[PDB]
C-alpha cells in the first residue's frame with residue numbers, strides 16, 4: 535500500500551504502508567518518527583475536513599490513497615474557513631496554507647474576520663498567528679477591491695489599477711492637467727501621475743481625489 539504524508543509545508547510524499555488497517559502509531563512510524571515523538575496526525579477527509587488520528591485509532595486504508603499531515607507538535611489550534619472548522623498543529627499559518635487547506639480558488643480574496651475594524655486581507659506569504667485568543671475566522675470573497683474616486687466608490691477587479699484607467703472609468707478626461715494625490719488610510723496624501731499604478735490591497739479604501 536501507499537499513503538501520502540506531508541508537514542506544515544504541505545508538500546506530500548509517498549510512504550509505504552505494509553498494513554491495510556494501521557493506527558496512528560503505525561502511520562507515525564512509517565513517516566519517520568520514533569514512538570516517543572508522538573507526532574500529530576491529521577487525515578484529510580474527502581469533504582475537506584481534517585480528522586485527528588489518535589495513536590491507537592485504526593484507519594481503514596482500503597478506500598483510496600489517503601493523505602495525512604504528520605507534524606511533531608504538542609498542540610493544535612482551531613480556525614475556520616467560511617464557517618467550516620479546521621485544525622492546525624502550528625501557531626503560525628500562512629495565507630498559502632489556508633488556501634491549500636480550504637481548497638479556495640485563486641480567483642477569490644481571503645479575509646480574516648475582525649470586530650473592531652475592517653476585516654484584514656491575507657496575502658499568500660502573510661503569516662497569521664493562531665495563538666491569539668478565540669477561534670480565528672477566515673472568509674473567501676470575490677476578488678474585487680474598492681476605490682474612492684471623487685467621493686464615489688468604484689469596485690475594480692484587479693489588485694492594482696492604472697490611475698489613467700481609474701479616471702477613465704470614473705468619466706473624467708485623463709488628458710487634462712490634474713493635480714492627482716492619493717490618500718491611503720493612516721498615511722499622508724502622496725502626489726501621483728496619470729500613468730502611475732495604485733495597489734488597492736492596502737487596508738481600507740483609498741481616496742483618489744483630483745483637482746485641475
Ligand SMILES: [Ca+2]
Nearest residue numbers: 553554555556
Ligand atoms: Ca492492523
Ligand SMILES: [Ca+2]
Nearest residue numbers: 586587588591
Ligand atoms: Ca479521531
Ligand SMILES: [Ca+2]
Nearest residue numbers: 647648649653
Ligand atoms: Ca467584521
Ligand SMILES: [Ca+2]
Nearest residue numbers: 664666668670
Ligand atoms: Ca486562536
Ligand SMILES: [Ca+2]
Nearest residue numbers: 734736738739
Ligand atoms: Ca484597499
